[PDB]
From a paper:
Small molecules in the environment can be sensed as attractants or repellents by a repertoire of chemoreceptors termed methyl-accepting chemotaxis proteins (MCPs) or transducer-like proteins (Tlps). Analysis of the crystal structure of the LBDs of C. jejuni Tlp1 and Tlp3 revealed that they have a double Cache (dCache; calcium channels and chemotaxis receptors) fold. dCache domains consist of two tandem subdomains (termed membrane-distal and membrane-proximal) that likely emerged through tandem segmental DNA duplication. We also discovered eight new small-molecule ligands that, in addition to isoleucine, signal through Tlp3 as attractants by binding directly to its LBD, and determined the crystal structures of the respective complexes. The hydrophobic side-chain binding pocket and the conserved protein residues that interact with the ammonium and carboxylate groups of the ligands determine the specificity of this chemoreceptor, which appears to have evolved as a receptor for natural non-polar amino acids.
To identify candidate signal molecules of this class, we generated a virtual library comprising ~2600 L-isoleucine analogues and screened it by docking into the known L-isoleucine binding site of Tlp3 LBD. The three water-soluble compounds with the lowest predicted free energy of binding (4-methyl-L-isoleucine, β-methyl-L-norleucine, and 3-methyl-L-isoleucine) were selected for the subsequent experiments. In the thermal shift assay, the ΔTm values for all three compounds (2.8 °C, 3.7 °C, and 2.0 °C) exceeded the 1.0 °C threshold, suggesting their direct binding to Tlp3 LBD. Among the non-natural amino acids, α-amino-N-valeric acid showed a slightly lower affinity for Tlp3 LBD (168 μM) than isoleucine and leucine, followed by β-methyl-L-norleucine (Kd = 294 μM), 4-methyl-L-isoleucine (Kd = 324 μM), and 3-methyl-L-isoleucine (Kd = 484 μM). Comparison of the crystal structure of Tlp3 LBD/L-isoleucine complex with the final refined structures of Tlp3 LBD in complex with L-leucine, L-valine, α-amino-N-valeric acid, 4-methyl-L-isoleucine, 3-methyl-L-isoleucine, L-alanine, L-phenylalanine, and β-methyl-L-norleucine shows that the binding modes of all the new ligands are very similar to that of isoleucine. The aliphatic side chain of 4-methyl-L-isoleucine forms van der Waals contacts with the side chains of Tyr118, Trp151, and Val171 and is positioned within 4.5 Å of the side chains of Asn116, Val126, Leu128, and Leu144. Furthermore, simultaneous single methyl group substitution at Positions 3 and 4 has a deleterious effect on the binding affinity, as compared to single methyl substitutions at positions 3 or 4: 4-methylisoleucine displays a lower binding affinity (Kd = 324 µM) than L-isoleucine or L-leucine.
Residue numbers in the entry: 38 to 132, 137 to 285
The structure:
C-alpha cells in the first residue's frame, strides 16, 4: 500500500521486463545478422570465381553448384540458389544442384527487390514454392567487376526464428509486418482468434520500450513493446507484483 513500496516494486518490475524484452529483441537481431553474414560470405565466394566459371550455364552448375551445396549444409538452410537473367535458377535444395527453368523467378519479390538495392533483401515469411515450408529469404544481387552475375537466395525456415524466440525468458512475443502474431514463449498466444488490440494500442500510445498498464478480464497487466525490423516485440505480465 505505502506509495514508497509500490514505487519500488514498479521500478523493479519495469527493469526486469525491459531486460527480458531486450533479450527477445537481441534474438531477432542476431538471427538476421548471422544470416546476412552468411549470405555476404557466399556472395564473395561466387564473385571471386573467374568469369570463365560464371559465363556458361554448365560452368555455373559445376563451379557455383558445389559452393551453394557446402554453404547450404554448413548452416542447414532449406534452399540456396542463384537466379539468372534468362529465368533459370541453380537450386541446391534440402533433400547435385539443378538448373531449373520452371520457377518463374522474375515474378518473385526476392529476385526483383535484390535488383533494386545494393544491400541484402530480407523477405517476410512465405511458403516456399519447392519444399512447402515457411521460409525467410535473404537475397543479394551478385556483381563481378560491376557486371551482374545473378541473384543469390538463401531460404531459412521461419520456424528457426520462432523456436529461438519461444525459448527466451519472459512472456515475450513477436508480431509480423501485418500485426499478426508470429512467435511466442507461451504457445497459446498463437491462437489466431486472440484479439491483440489492447497491447497493440497501448504500444501505439506509448512508443518503443515504454512500459504501460492495460486490463484483461478486469485485471491489471503491465507491458511494453518495441519495433525490431518490421516486427513488433512485446512482453506482458500481471500487475499483481505491484498491487499485491
Ligand atoms: C528458387 C526459388 C523459386 C525458391 C524456391 C524460393 N523460396 C521461392 O519460393 O520463390
Ligand atoms: Na554475424
Ligand atoms: Na555456416
Ligand atoms: Na520469452
Amino acid at each position: 500500500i505505502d506509495p514508497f513500496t509500490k514505487t519500488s516494486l514498479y521500478e523493479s518490475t519495469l527493469k526486469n521486463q525491459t531486460d527480458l524484452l531486450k533479450v527477445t529483441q537481441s534474438t531477432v537481431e542476431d538471427f538476421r545478422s548471422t544470416n546476412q553474414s552468411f549470405t555476404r560470405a557466399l556472395e564473395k565466394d561466387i564473385a571471386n570465381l573467374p568469369y570463365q566459371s560464371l559465363i556458361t550455364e554448365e560452368n555455373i552448375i559445376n563451379n557455383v553448384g558445389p559452393i551453394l551445396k557446402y554453404y547450404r549444409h554448413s548452416i542447414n538452410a532449406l534452399n540456396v540458389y542463384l537466379g539468372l537473367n534468362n529465368g533459370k535458377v541453380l537450386l541446391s535444395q534440402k533433400s547435385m544442384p539443378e538448373l531449373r527453368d520452371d520457377l518463374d523467378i522474375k515474378t518473385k519479390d526476392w529476385y526483383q527487390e535484390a535488383l533494386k538495392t545494393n544491400d541484402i533483401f530480407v523477405t517476410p515469411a512465405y511458403l516456399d514454392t519447392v519444399l512447402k515450408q515457411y521460409v525467410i529469404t535473404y537475397s543479394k544481387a551478385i556483381y563481378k567487376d560491376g557486371k551482374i552475375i545473378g541473384v543469390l537466395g538463401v531460404d531459412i525456415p521461419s520456424e528457426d526464428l520462432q523456436n529461438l524466440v519461444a525459448k527466451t525468458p519472459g512472456n515475450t512475443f513477436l508480431f509480423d509486418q501485418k500485426n499478426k502474431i508470429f512467435a511466442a514463449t507461451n504457445k497459446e498466444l498463437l491462437n489466431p482468434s486472440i484479439d491483440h488490440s489492447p497491447v497493440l494500442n497501448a504500444y501505439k500510445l506509448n512508443g518503443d520500450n515504454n512500459f504501460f498498464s492495460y486490463k484483461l478480464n478486469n485485471e491489471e497487466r503491465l507491458g511494453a513493446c518495441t519495433k525490431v525490423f518490421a516486427y513488433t516485440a512485446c512482453i506482458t505480465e500481471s500487475a499483481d507484483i505491484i498491487n499485491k
